[PDB]
Design brief:
This is part of a larger assembly, with 2 copies of chain A, 1 copy of chain C (about 375 residues), 1 copy of chain D (about 130 residues) and 1 copy of chain E (about 220 residues).
Chain C (H helix, E strand, L loop, with lengths): L13 H8 L12 H15 L20 H13 L23 H9 L8 H10 L11 E4 L13 H4 L11 E4 L12 H5 L13 H11 L8 H14 L4 H13 L16 H8 L7 H5 L4 H12 L10 H15 L9 H10 L3 E2 L12 E2 L5 H4 L5
Parallel strand pairs in C: 1-2
Antiparallel strand pairs in C: 3-4
Chain D lengths: L14 H13 L23 H13 L20 E5 L26 E5 L9
Parallel strand pairs in D: 1-2
Chain E lengths: L14 H8 L9 E5 L5 H9 L7 E5 L6 H10 L23 H8 L10 E6 L12 H5 L1 H4 L4 E7 L16 E4 L5 H7 L11 H14 L3
Parallel strand pairs in E: 1-4, 1-5, 2-3, 3-4
The chains are: A mainly alpha (about 190), C mainly alpha (about 375), D alpha+beta (about 130), E alpha/beta (about 220).
Subcellular location (chain B): Nucleus
Family (chain B): Belongs to the ORC4 family.
Protein name (chain B): Origin recognition complex subunit 4
Chain lengths: ~190, ~40, ~375, ~130, ~220
């Protein structure tokens, strides 16, 4: 008796405005049978001791978690130091058309944003800059041209970026707690001192 | 049952081939000699 | 009768043709070569009666009869030795690929003659002092070596010392150096190897058009199952490719298998039709590129289309991965799909990277991926507009 | 009483670096005329990793004293339990990549391997 | 309970995911589960507690302590014979170095009644230094289910993202799980749970809020 309702419930979900959209999305990316294996076992994990039948809800949530932008969600769990760094090299890429640059150039603009601001406690010191940039080394967000010098110190790096000029702008409205004096600096092309 | 993903050279493949037939040895593997007469009316 | 299926006797005609066409079930060798078999016959015969030693180096692609014509040279000399005509000889065989290290050749030689086995040094020293032994008779042995490029070392102490052995007093070694092209002694090998050898290199030319139709006729002397129009058609394509003796009978075996697919009908045809000869060419030389774009999806065909669009206004076949992502959204939005995410960019690349249809370094520089098309840029345009 | 001494001119690599640490723990123990005596040793290989120093520290606290360990590791050698203390007198010239591999192993294995580090900076601890 | 949920109060959507993949002893799973996080400490502390609670056969090895493939495959068997059966195997060592013999000797150990129809977990700590050696040990764990034919689930706790260790000829595509980031509303409660007995609850939590607003930006 339970075997007849199993094959019949799939037919009711095969013709649906939301189920057919998930099938055609994965078929265009990879039509291989292996790409569909993860779309059938993830929905079975949700079915526990309180799911007598199936629906179009347990199959849509299992296809989104395996297709999100894995290169844009890693910036949500950060502070403000490393967030301002990845935007600093983004502004330098617009004026330096494809050419390497070291880290000491980022320090030149660090003391430039401190102006046009009232005297408060937001100002830092100096060793915090190298500590905030080193956190991106273990995350593999920068890549050398071809050689990593062994005798290189905290001035000679000639690193670049491993992102793009598209997902960096769309990851600002979804970031939790965005200051007003920081978001305006990222959208503009640095027109003030 | 062979798999090319495990084997990376050629000297190792001459010894692991006897682990599936087991027609002249035991759990032990015979001399290191590279196979020369692989049995071939 | 020990085995349950001890070779079922072919009661039909198509099942019997495979016995006379098999590369192993050969009654003799490949004919249509009497001007070359007689030349090497008088050469080996003059060495046994003289009790001396010489060298021999032929040439040709691996598929002109170097493994079948050399067997008849031994089968004819063994018959005269039993009738008190030629002195007896010893049968020695050794291949160049059966040994991993190129210095282990001294083990197969000592084991074939006697029974003592040592190594590449313990044995290699006993064979040097045995050939120069004064006061010991030997026999007119034959040395058959194959694939000489694998025995090449840095010191060149494998091919040089091998040719100096039969150039002594009591030395009856007949070296049959088998290789590929003839310019090897003047390319890979240096001066010492080519000097002590000689200019006795008679190459073997591939079979002609009139010779391929005769060898296949000898195998099908009493096999009434193939028309005369299909035999000359199969031997015609192989004769224009390279004249290989192995690329002719393999196509005929495919003709014996495509005809059995139509024998499932109640009717039992006799000779082959004209459709079996046309299908024996496309299936023999199949293409692994025209079927990749036809059986593709939607995102796969759109990703390869933007590659040619960027290699038109630039003139360079090398680009980056950040530039190809910009124009990829333009072709995806026009047809009616949202913008592609960044995480799936390596997913669609791993599919084409697994089959290695796009030469690119592994996941080390995601934004500096070198695009290298495995095929040309004009053949992908004709195979795309067919849909 | 166990003192391990090493510097930068020894072995600046991965395999030979840990090899010198094995001989240091064996020389500082045979200098006490207690139960052990002369025993010629030939290093010819005995594979080792992180359990070679952990198993040796557990066996040395059992055969030396005639059953004197209390409960939950305390009062091993009369007073307190002897820790594994090393000195780094010449570490600024040593390879920085090797100094970041031997510290991340004893972090999670500290409950069964008391390690004590002594730094000897010849300038200022700011460069650390 | 004391160290599975009280450490991070933002795992309510991850407990039902790992427990669903476990099931029973005779239940299987993917041969490789890649889970990358941040700080390389949040996903490690929760692993040592969740596995020590349900009492399941599991080991812990590291790829940074050993730079050769001979020592990596040796430490796995050293921590397996002690729990392979109900009794010890007389403390016997294993002498091997060939990578092809690893799948042969592992089947003989997983033959007893303790590891016959049970799920074996292989946690690879710090899985971001495997690209320094050879490019052949990466797809070995992705296709271990087909070769070994045993209920073995290899876990990964690396800092690098998944789309960085792609081989030249491709490999199996498993499931990429991403733990949620440290929320601002949940980090305040986990830093005040470990209160000393010298104070209380409301009196001690007030000294944490005054330090979170000044240390969140740094």
């Amino acid at each position: 008796v339970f075997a007849e309702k199993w094959n019949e419930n799939v037919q009711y979900l095969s013709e649906d405005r939301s189920v057919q959209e998930v099938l055609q999305k994965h078929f265009n990316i990879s039509k291989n049978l292996r790409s569909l294996h993860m779309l059938l076992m993830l929905a079975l994990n949700r079915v526990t001791a309180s799911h007598p039948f199936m629906t179009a809800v347990d199959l849509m949530e299992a296809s989104q978690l395996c297709s999100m932008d894995s290169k844009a969600n890693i910036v949500h769990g950060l502070s403000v130091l490393e967030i301002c760094l990845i935007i600093a090299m983004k502004h330098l890429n617009d004026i330096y058309e494809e050419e390497p640059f070291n880290f000491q150039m980022v320090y030149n603009e660090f003391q430039k944003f401190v102006q046009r601001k009232a005297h408060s406690v937001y100002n830092f010191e100096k060793p915090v800059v190298m500590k905030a940039f080193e956190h991106l080394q273990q995350l593999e967000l920068i890549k050398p041209m071809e050689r990593t010098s062994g005798n290189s110190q905290r001035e000679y790096q000639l690193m670049k970026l491993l992102l793009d000029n598209t997902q960096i702008m769309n990851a600002l409205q979804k970031y939790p707690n965005c200051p007003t004096d920081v978001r305006q600096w990222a959208t503009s092309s640095l027109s003030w001192l | 049952h062979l798999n090319g993903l495990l084997q990376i050279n050629d000297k190792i493949a001459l010894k692991e081939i006897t682990r599936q037939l087991n027609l002249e040895n035991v759990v032990g593997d015979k001399v290191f000699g590279s196979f020369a007469e692989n049995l071939s009316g | 009768r020990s085995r349950s299926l001890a070779a079922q006797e072919p009661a039909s005609v198509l099942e019997e043709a495979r016995l006379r066409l098999h590369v192993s079930a050969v009654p003799e060798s490949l004919p249509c070569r009497e001007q070359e078999f007689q030349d090497i016959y008088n050469f080996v015969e003059s060495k046994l009666l003289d009790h001396t030693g010489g060298c021999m180096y032929i040439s040709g692609v691996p598929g002109t009869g170097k493994t079948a014509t050399v067997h008849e040279v031994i089968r004819c000399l063994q018959q005269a030795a039993q009738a008190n005509d030629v002195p007896p000889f010893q049968y020695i065989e050794v291949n160049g690929m059966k040994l991993t290290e190129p210095h282990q050749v001294y083990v197969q030689i000592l084991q074939k003659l006697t029974g003592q086995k040592a190594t590449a040094n313990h044995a290699a020293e006993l064979l040097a002092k045995q050939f120069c032994t004064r006061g010991s008779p030997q026999e007119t042995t034959v040395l058959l070596v194959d694939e000489l490029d694998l025995l090449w070392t840095h010191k060149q102490d494998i091919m040089y010392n091998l040719f100096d052995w039969p150039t002594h007093k009591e030395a009856r070694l007949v070296v049959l150096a088998i290789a590929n092209t003839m310019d090897l002694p003047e390319r890979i090998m240096m001066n010492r190897v080519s000097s002590r050898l000689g200019l006795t290199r008679m190459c073997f030319q591939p079979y002609t058009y009139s010779q391929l139709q005769q060898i296949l006729r000898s195998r099908l002397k009493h096999l009434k199952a193939f028309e005369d129009d299909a035999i000359q058609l199969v031997a015609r394509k192989v004769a224009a490719l390279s004249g290989d003796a192995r690329r002719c009978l393999d196509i005929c075996r495919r003709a014996t298998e495509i005809c059995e697919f139509s024998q499932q009908k109640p009717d039992s045809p006799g000779l082959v039709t004209i459709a079996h000869s046309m299908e024996a060419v496309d299936e023999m030389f199949s293409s692994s590129y025209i079927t990749a774009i036809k059986n593709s999806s939607v995102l796969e065909q759109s990703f390869l289309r933007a590659i040619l669009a960027e290699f038109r206004r630039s003139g360079l076949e090398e680009a980056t991965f950040q530039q190809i992502y910009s124009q990829h959204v333009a072709l995806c939005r026009m047809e009616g799909l949202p913008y592609p995410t960044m995480s799936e960019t390596m997913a669609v690349c791993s599919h084409l990277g697994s089959c290695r249809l796009l030469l690119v370094e592994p996941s080390r520089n995601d934004l500096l991926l070198r695009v290298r098309l495995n095929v040309s840029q004009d053949d992908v345009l004709y195979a795309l507009k067919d849909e | 009483p166990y003192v391990v001494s090493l510097q930068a001119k020894d072995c600046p690599d991965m395999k030979h670096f840990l090899q010198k640490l094995i001989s240091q723990l064996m020389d500082c123990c045979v200098d006490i005329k207690s139960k052990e005596e002369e025993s010629v040793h030939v290093t010819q290989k005995t594979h080792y990793s992180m359990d070679s120093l952990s198993s040796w520290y557990m066996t040395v606290t059992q055969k030396t004293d005639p059953k004197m360990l209390s409960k939950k590791r305390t009062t091993s050698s009369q007073w307190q339990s002897p820790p594994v203390v090393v000195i780094l007198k010449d570490m600024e010239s040593f390879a920085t990549k090797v100094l970041q591999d031997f510290i991340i192993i004893s972090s999670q294995h500290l409950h069964e391997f008391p390690l004590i580090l002594i730094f000897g900076i010849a300038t200022s601890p700011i460069i650390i | 309970m004391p160290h599975l949920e009280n450490v991070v109060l933002c795992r309510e959507s991850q407990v039902s995911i790992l427990q669903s993949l476990f099931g029973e002893r005779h239940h299987f799973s993917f041969p490789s589960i890649f889970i990358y996080g941040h700080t390389a400490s949040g996903k490690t502390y929760v692993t040592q507690t969740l596995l020590k609670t349900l009492e399941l056969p599991h080991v812990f090895v590291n790829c940074v302590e050993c730079f050769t493939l001979r020592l990596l495959l040796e430490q796995i068997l050293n921590k397996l014979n002690h729990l392979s059966s109900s009794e010890d195997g007389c403390s016997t060592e294993i002498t091997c170095e060939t990578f092809n013999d690893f799948v042969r000797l592992f089947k003989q150990v997983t033959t007893a009644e303790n590891l016959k129809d049970q799920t074996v977990y292989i946690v690879l700590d710090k899985a971001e230094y495997l690209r320094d050696m050879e490019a052949n040990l990466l797809p070995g764990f992705l296709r271990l289910q087909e070769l070994a034919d045993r209920n073995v689930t290899v876990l990964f706790l690396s800092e690098i993202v998944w789309e960085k260790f792609r081989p030249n000829t491709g490999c199996f595509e498993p499931f990429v799980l991403y733990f949620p980031d440290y929320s601002i509303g949940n980090l305040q409660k986990i830093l005040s749970h470990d209160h000393p007995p010298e104070y209380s609850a409301d009196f001690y939590a007030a000294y944490i809020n005054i330090l979170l607003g000044v240390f969140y930006t740094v």
